[PDB]
Amino acid sequence: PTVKPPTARKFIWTNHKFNLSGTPQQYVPYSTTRKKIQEWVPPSTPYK
Amino acid sequence: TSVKPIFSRDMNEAKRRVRELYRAWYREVPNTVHLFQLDISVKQGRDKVREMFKKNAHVTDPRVVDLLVIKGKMELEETINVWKQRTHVMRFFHETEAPRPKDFLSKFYVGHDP
Amino acid sequence: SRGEYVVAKLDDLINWARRSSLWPMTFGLACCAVEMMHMAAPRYDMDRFGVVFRASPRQSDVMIVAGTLTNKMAPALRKVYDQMPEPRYVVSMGSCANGGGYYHYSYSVVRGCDRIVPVDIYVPGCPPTAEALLYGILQLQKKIKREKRLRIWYRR
Amino acid sequence: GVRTSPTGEKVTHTGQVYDDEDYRRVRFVGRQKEVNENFAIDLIAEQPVSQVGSRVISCDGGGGALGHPRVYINLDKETKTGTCGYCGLQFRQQH
Amino acid sequence: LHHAVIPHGKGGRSSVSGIVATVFGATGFLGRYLVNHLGRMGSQVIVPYRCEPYDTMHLRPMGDLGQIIFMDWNGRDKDSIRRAVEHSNVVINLVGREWETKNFDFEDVFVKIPQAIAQVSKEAGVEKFIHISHLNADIKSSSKYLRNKAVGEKEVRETFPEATIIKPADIFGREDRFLNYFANIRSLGKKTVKQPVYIVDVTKGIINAIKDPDARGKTFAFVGPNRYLLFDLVQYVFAVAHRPWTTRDKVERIHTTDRTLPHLPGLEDLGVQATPLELKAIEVLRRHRTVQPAKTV
Amino acid sequence: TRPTVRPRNDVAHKQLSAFGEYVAEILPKYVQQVQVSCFSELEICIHPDGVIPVLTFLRDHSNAQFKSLADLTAVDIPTRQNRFEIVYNLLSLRFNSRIRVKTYTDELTPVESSVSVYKAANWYEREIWDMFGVFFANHPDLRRILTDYGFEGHPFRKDFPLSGYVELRYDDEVKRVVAEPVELAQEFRKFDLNSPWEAFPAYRQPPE
Amino acid sequence: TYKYVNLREPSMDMKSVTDRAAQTLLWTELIRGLGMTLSYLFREPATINYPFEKGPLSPRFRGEHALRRYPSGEERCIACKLCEAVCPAQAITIEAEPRADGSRRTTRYDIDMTKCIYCGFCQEACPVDAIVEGPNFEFSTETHEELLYNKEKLLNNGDKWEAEIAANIQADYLYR
Amino acid sequence: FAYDGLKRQRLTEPMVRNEKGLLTHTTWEDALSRVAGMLQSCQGNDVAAIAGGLVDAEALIALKDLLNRVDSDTLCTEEVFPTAGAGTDLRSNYLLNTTIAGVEEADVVLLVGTNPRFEAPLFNARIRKSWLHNDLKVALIGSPVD
Ligand SMILES: CCCCCCCCCCCCCCCCCC(=O)OC[C@H](COP(=O)(O)OCCN)OC(=O)CCCCCCCCCCCCCCCCC
Ligand SMILES: NC(=O)C1=CN([C@@H]2O[C@H](COP(=O)(O)OP(=O)(O)OC[C@H]3O[C@@H](n4cnc5c(N)ncnc54)[C@H](OP(=O)(O)O)[C@@H]3O)[C@@H](O)[C@H]2O)C=CC1
Ligand code: SF4
Ligand code: SF4
Ligand code: SF4
Ligand SMILES: [Zn+2]
């Protein structure tokens, strides 16, 4: 990369991180979607 | 309705083979509890054998019970020769499984299964 | 304190001897055995890390589960695991040992060896290369390097 | 343009964040929620609208065979720009 | 009730039970089988561990992916306890030592740590709390163990008023220190009467106490079905095991009789039938081999 | 149709059609169909009472000499009343040729074991017991060969599910690998991929 | 068109008989084996010094997955689900919706790296070069669920390795 | 396009009135017990039912049998059909007796008091297909709707 540098981008990591597994910086998976079914919210006023 | 048999000509020879397979299992159960060092009693294993024979008691087809006798001889052969481990013998006893809901109301409470 | 320094240095000593003398028992289940045989081949050479080639399962220190675990062999895997002396470690090599892999939805495949044995290092690939498996072995060595058996024993 | 819930959790580019009373935040306890802080919806907004003198423009995302399938965009509406369906680069007829 | 904590599935490994459980002391003997029976339902089990992570490895195949969250904690750090219990809907305490150590005595393990866990679990909004005392816990007891455990039970009862407190008598099992104590002692026989309870019965009682809403604020006494004298119990242990580390607190507790508390419910009021000693003692003591049953009272 | 199309072998097609007529007229007691594929493979569909007389013929006859059993196969086709299709693949090293002997059975009718003709069949049809449930009569050691020891069901039957009914895990309560009913954390996603337009007009079946 | 391995009838003259007997009594082929082993003792071994020296790879190498971006920051994935229709392991789970500017974009892009067979049908089925299987092979984890990548982890692998991935695609794309 | 109301405003858990008079979530045991304790205290006209617009015949005959154990016949629908005369005894005076398909066989259709474009839009599509291909004569008694 000193002779032929990589083509720069605004989104490439300027700080390369090594393998973070076993550290508190490790990856934890999760569902990246929102909630599908919406529940009914009962009225906060009395019914009499 | 004229079919080729497996071993039995009618249900009497079929019940004879069922009965001899039951004799072989009944004799084998104490040896199985000993050499697999199972934590069940001999009576508990013999009750399991009686359960596995009464589960198929509704069958009136000689070919179907001939295949049940053949598969029972195969299971017995896997038991006597130590081909099963302790785990394969104890899979007849569904011991880690929680008891299933039986009546309507508990099946209603747990979920959607009929 | 003084005893905290002593248990720190003794942890460093015993972790050095345990990570620098790993003895693997490799389950040659499937295609991952070929790539473990390349991790023992001259290019990568596990033996220069103190990682011997094919220790017996009763003197080995780590069990490399290299291949597909089926339902017919899972009690044999658990038997060999129970017969290992402690400290014993488990490297899961390849997708079938990790999570079932290409045979995940099969009727006869244990969906990952972690349903059977506790796994320390999950090495991903189909197969992971001999360089990637050697990476997983060195990550296991780094995991042993930060063990605190005597420090936690001193603090209990 | 990452933002933050009242729980302190980062909201992703989808809009995903756990509720406060959701137990599944316990997976990030002692660890981190890996989010990507380059939101593509903001990064394609940063691109300028290309003034072209044609009526139909072709976009392949640049790079030739390293972009997307080449599409043709009509520029006869003057209220709306002509947005590419693949790369989001939007075009305008200059007249 | 939140949508993620609604139960789903058929109660298997990949199912959802809606039980978000923080088991303090899961690295021990009761926590082993408790995390087993929780994780096989599909419960979110949080394991706060104090020890080496290696000594938690057996807890890892006990549930589905992500259903056991290991995290560090200290008994004298309330911040770590809050970090462990702030998402749980049930907190089970199982912290115990048969012997007092240099950094923790019985007052630390049985009084300070359970009151800290119960206070932090009260002020974090945890619905259910389960405490595990001993059957023979008494202020005027001969052993320091049972005195401090009676003190800690009183403190847990007065800082979590709905705490299900459970009294096992003498838990036997594979990794126990009751039948494995007697098989490796090679103390004596007195007028001491015991009814030992089986560990799977205790685990089913704890999980049915989670599932029963009426078990809140109660106090259960998990006892075995058969009361034995100490002497013929020890002779039955040496009869099954094919035979011809201690302190005086354990000597006082082995010669302490298992009391009878009929005013407290037991295993049967949670729906658990008590498994007798003779159906499981061969399973326990088969490891010690290189039988006429014991006399009940 | 030169570069991208497979060349047709008319010489082998004529020779295999002639030898199929030969086998069909020597053994009319059992031969039900004889067909030759467009890529020149001869299939002799026979009656299941003539498994041994046909195969002993092709193995021993001086114009056949099918001395090799390459493969033995069952195929579950549930829309037939005889759902299992037993397929013998035979190799004549003398005449440098291959033949296919096909027959049928259902779950309950036994097929005669061909270990008296090809001892190679000893495991193959045993695998047909394990995967499909077809029983083979007068077999030396008929038992399972590939499934686990307590395995219920025959897996390559098409009514058997992809994942099974049970799955294993280690359980530390009973200190044992145990079987439980199968639950998948992600279900196998079923893809309906078939196009509603007819792909091959040559294979069109006549309507009702 | 064939040859006979081991069909040599040996000579029975006293010369060859005494040659074979001297081979029997003086262990000629055993010293030949010792000579070949001694020959490899003085060869330079083939051992590279890992981790400092690395095994040689090609730009086609199929390692860790990464979701890419166009050279403006816009992500290349237009939510078309070809990579999960082609996926032989069904390792890819995709759910999509129109985002706030109306672009066809994913909300769920999961790859189970423990189902994945690393065969690269996703990168060759992708019409817009979004999913690629990059050059990273040293990504072993300590936990099973760390190998269950969501869209955030894959876009971070893209942002992490783009300077290498773009050059590998640049070196290989005229073979594709 | 109404399948997305099928994922909003949904009832997911049993609700009972708490001590403040508000609906709070509860279990099935509590909710079924608090309904059944009131159902055991009813008899005759003390209990009745209203059937909504989207109820299957299984739940309809279920609740009919349940209220007939209490000796209650008062089970109603929202949509008013007159019980005068034959009522709901003969099926012929509350059905589309011809058929939806029978519109293709008619020659004169008289629509009375209905706007079938929005009340039964594919029934109106069948009337339009008969209008187009069979020269159907349609008359409407009611407001001049489109
Ligand atoms: C009161 C306080 C003291 C308490 C008692 C302790 C007395 C002294 C005991 C020995 C020294 C203890 C410290 C051990 C090493 C700690 C530092 C360490 O781990 O250094 C790592 C370094 C190699 O780095 P590494 O991580 O392997 O990197 C891989 C390659 N890049 O490692 C190295 O460079 C090599 C490390 C060698 C360790 C020491 C040598 C072996 C032990 C000799 C003494 C004991 C055995 C005596 C003889 C036994 C029978 C033969
Ligand atoms: N026979 C029995 O087992 C019976 C037990 N009980 C009670 O049940 C409870 C659990 O019993 P049991 O499993 O057998 O006991 P164990 O000693 O086997 O387990 C105790 C657990 O608590 C942890 N722990 C102990 N001391 C501390 C401390 N100072 N700080 C933090 N964690 C600590 C241990 O972790 P680590 O490994 O890190 O030390 C372990 O996980 C105890 O309170 C005991 O008194 C009651 C009746 C019978
Ligand atoms: S993960 Fe793949 S390549 Fe590796 S052993 Fe399994 S099937 Fe073979
Ligand atoms: S990664 Fe490519 S193939 Fe997969 S959905 Fe996105 S654009 Fe389509
Ligand atoms: S490399 Fe193959 S198995 Fe892996 S995600 Fe891509 S298509 Fe699926
Ligand atoms: Zn474009």
For residue B44, the surrounding DSSP H or E stretch is helix B42-54
Q: How many CB atoms lie within 10 A of CB G51?
A: 11
**Chain G CB contacts of C138 below 8 Å:** 51
Asked if E66 and A39 come within 8 Å (Cβ–Cβ), the reply is no
Strand H108-112 to H137-141 pairing: parallel
CA G43 to chain centre: 29
At H64, which helix (H) or strand (E)? helix H57-68
Q: By the 8 A CB rule, do B45 and B86 touch?
A: no
Q: What is the largest CA-CA distance in chain B?
A: 50
**D8 neighbors E50 (Cβ within 8 angstroms):** no
Sequential DSSP letters for chain C: -HHHHHHHHHHHHHHHHHHTT--EEEEE-STHHHHHHHHSSTTT-GGGGT--S---TTT-SEEEEESPPBTTTHHHHHHHHHTSPSS-EEEEEHHHHHH-GGGTT-TTB-SSGGGTS--SEEE-SSSPPHHHHHHHHHHHHHHHHT--HHHHHHT-
> In this complex, is the C-beta atom of D1 within 8 Å of any C-beta atom belonging to chain G?
no
Kindly report the backbone phi and psi dihedral angles of residue E167, in degrees, each rounded to the nearest multiple of 5, phi listed first. Answer: -110, 90
Question: From CA F61, how far away is CA E172, in angstroms rounded?
Answer: 74
Q: What angle do CA D32, D34, D35 make, to 5 degrees?
A: 135
| Paired tokens of E260 | 């009878």
With the most atoms of ligand 4 within 8 angstroms of its CB, the residue from G75, G105, G106, G128 to mutate is: G128
Find the domain containing B19 and state its range.
1-114
Question: Which of G68, G92, G93 is the pocket-test mutation for ligand 5 (most atoms within 8 Å of CB)?
Answer: G92
H or E element that contains B31: helix B11-35
Smallest CA-to-CA distance from E274 within E170, E150, E153 is with: E170
Half-sphere exposure (CA, 13 Å, Cβ side) for F6?
6
The owner of tokens 């090679």 is E186
H110 touches H142 (CB < 8 A): no
What number does the ligand 3 atom closest to the CA of G117 have?
2
How far, rounded to the nearest angstrom, does the alpha carbon of residue D55 sit from its chain's CA centroid?
Answer: 25
Contact B52, B44 (CB under 8 A): no
Distance between CA atoms of residues E117 and E127, nearest Å: 13
Q: Do E36 and F173 touch (CB under 8 A)?
A: yes
Ligand 5 atom 8 nearest Cα: G87
Select from E1, E2, E3, E83 the residue whose CB has the most chain A CBs within 10 Å, as the one to mutate to test that interface. Answer: E3
Distance from C-alpha of G124 to C-alpha of G75, rounded to nearest angstrom: 17
D91's CB contacts (< 8 A; 6+ apart) are D49, D50, D52, D57, D59, D73, D75, D81, D82, D83, D84
Q: Hey, is H96 helix, strand or coil? A: coil
Contact yes or no for G114/C100 (Cβ under 8 A): yes
Contacts of F178 (CB under 8 A, 6+ apart): B87, B90, B91, B95, B96, F168, F169, F170, F171
Residue whose Cα lies nearest atom 6 of ligand 4: it is G77
- State whether G47 and C95 contact (CB < 8 Å): no
Helix (H) or strand (E) holding G67: strand G65-67
Q: Are strands C121-123 and C89-93 parallel, antiparallel or unpaired?
A: parallel
Phi, psi (deg, nearest 5) at residue F86: -85, 125
Q: Which two tokens stand for residue E57?
A: 């490895």
Cα separation, E124 vs G39, whole angstroms: 74
In 3D, which of H54, H88, H86 has the Cα closest to residue H73? H88
G111 lines ligand 4 (CB under 6 A): no
- Residue G68 CA, ligand 6 centroid: distance in Å: 15
G55 burial via Cβ count (<10 Å: 0-12, 13-18, 19+): middle
Q: Write down the residue that tokens 């038991």 correspond to.
A: B79
Q: Read out DSSP for chain F?
A: --SSSPPP-HHHHHHHHHHHHHHHHH-TTTEEEEEE-TT--EEEEE-GGGHHHHHHHHHH-TTT---EEEEEEEEE-TTSSS-EEEEEEEEETTTTEEEEEEEEE-SSS-EE-GGGT-TTHHHHHHHHHHHT---EET-SS-S-SSS-TT--S-TTSTTS-SS-SEEEEEETTTTEEEEEE---SSPPPP-----SS-S-GGGPPP--
Pairing type for strands F42-46 and F31-36 reads antiparallel
Per the structure block, which two tokens stand in for C113? 């060896």
B9 touches F113 (CB < 8 A) = no
E258 Cβ contact partners less than 8 Å away, ≥ 6 residues apart: E135, E136, E169, E170, E193, E194, E195, E196, E223, E227
Please report, for residues C113, F188, G35, the alpha-carbon distance to residue C69 in angstroms, rounded to integers and kept in the order given: 6, 20, 43
User: In Å, how far are F30, F62, F66, F68, F87 from F59, measured between CA atoms?
Assistant: 16, 9, 4, 8, 16
Task: Mark yes or no for CB contact E12/F175 under 8 Å.
Answer: no
Query: Nearest-CA residue of chain F relative to E65?
Result: F185
Kindly tell me the burial class for residue G163, based on how many C-beta atoms sit within 10 Å of its own C-beta (0-12, 13-18, 19 or more).
Answer: middle
CB E224 within 8 A of CB E178: no
Containing structural domain, residue D11:
1-95
Alpha carbons E114 and E76: distance in angstroms, whole number: 11
Q: Which of H8, H10, H15 comes nearest A42 by C-beta? A: H15
- Report the alpha-carbon distance of residue F10 to residue A27 in Å, rounded: 62
- Name the B residues in 32-91 with CB < 8 Å from any E CB: 37, 39
Question: CB-based contact (8 Å) between D45 and chain G?
Answer: yes
Token pair of G26 as six digits: 């003086």
Task: Determine if residue F161 is left, alpha or beta; phi over 0 gives left, psi from -120 to 50 gives alpha, anything else beta.
Answer: beta
- Determine contact, residues C77/C89, Cβ cutoff 8 Å: no
Give the span between the Cα atoms of F171 and E230, in whole angstroms: 33
State this model's resolution in angstroms.
Answer: 2.8
Q: Which of G89, G90, G147 sits opposite C122 (nearest CB)?
A: G147
Strand pairing report for C62-66 and C24-28: parallel
- What lies within 8 Å, CB to CB, of F142 at 6+ separation is F113, F126, F129, F135, F136
Residue E85 Cα distances to A12, D95, E70, E125, E129, angstroms: 39, 65, 12, 9, 11
Over its C-alpha atoms, chain G yields an Rg (Å, rounded) of 28
Q: How far is CA C131 from CA E80, G44, G55, G144, in A?
A: 39, 21, 7, 20
Separation of E84 CA from ligand 5 center, angstroms? 37
Q: Could you give phi then psi for residue E112, rounded to 5 degrees?
A: -75, -50
Measured in Å, residue G91 CA sits from the centre of ligand 6 at 28
Contact C115 F149 (CB under 8 A): no
Give the three-state DSSP class for G135.
coil
To probe the interface with G, which of F189, F193, F195 has the most G CB atoms within 10 Å?
F189
Contact in structure between E167 and E219 (CB atoms under 8 Å): yes
Q: Pick the closest to residue B88 from B98, B79, B77, B99 (CA basis).
A: B79
Q: Does B82 touch chain C (CB under 8 A)?
A: no
Report yes or no: F148 and C72 within 8 Å, Cβ to Cβ: yes
Could you tell me which of C53, C56, C65, C135 has the C-alpha nearest to residue C94?
A: C65
Residue E150: half-sphere exposure toward Cβ, Cα within 13 Å: 12
Chain H's closest residue to E6, CA to CA, is: H13
Residue with CA at minimum distance from ligand 1 atom 34: C16
Q: Helix-strand-coil percent breakdown of chain B, rounded to 5?
A: 60, 0, 40
Tell me the β-bridge partners of F44: F34, F101
Q: Encoding tokens for residue F168?
A: 């294993």
Taking the CA of residue G160 and the nearest CA in chain A, the distance in Å comes to 5
Q: Give the ligand at the shortest distance from the Cα of G88.
A: 5
Nearest CA to ligand 2 atom 27: E95
Q: Does C75 touch chain B (CB under 8 A)?
A: yes
Phi-psi region of G21 (alpha: psi -120 to 50; beta: other; left: phi over 0): alpha
- As for how many domains chain B has, the answer is 1
What is the DSSP code string of H1-22? Answer: --TTGGGSSB--S-EEE-TTS-
- Select from D12, D14, D65 the Cβ nearest to the Cβ of G173: D65
Q: How many CB pairs under 8 A join A and C?
A: 4
The answer to whether the Cβ–Cβ distance between C106 and F147 falls below 8 Å is: no
Determine which helix (DSSP H) or strand (DSSP E) holds D92, and give its type and residue range.
Answer: strand D90-93
Tell me the residue type at F101: V
Rounded Cα gap, residues C89 and C93, in angstroms? 13
Q: In Å, how far from its chain's centre is CA B28?
A: 13
Long-range contacts of G53-58 (CB under 8 A, 24+ apart): G54/C131, G55/C43, G55/C44, G55/C129, G55/C130, G55/C131, G57/G135
Q: Mutation test of the interface with chain B: which of F47, F108, F136, F145, choosing the one with the most B Cβ atoms within 10 A?
A: F108
Looking at the complex, does the CB of residue F162 fall below 8 Å from at least one CB of chain G?
A: no
Q: Give CA–CA dist C123/C134, Å, rounded.
A: 10
E strand or H helix at H110: strand H108-112
Domain count, chain D: 1
Residues of C with Cβ-Cβ distance to A21 under 8 angstroms: 139
Whether C75 and F177 lie within 8 Å, measured CB to CB: yes
Tokens 């006293």 correspond to G14
Provide the greatest CA pair distance for chain E: 60
Q: Residue G63: name the closest of G145, G152, G168, G151 by CA.
A: G168
Instruction: Tell me which residue of E194, C44, D65, D32 sits closest to G156, measured CA to CA.
Output: D32
Neighbours of H138 (CB within 10 A): 15
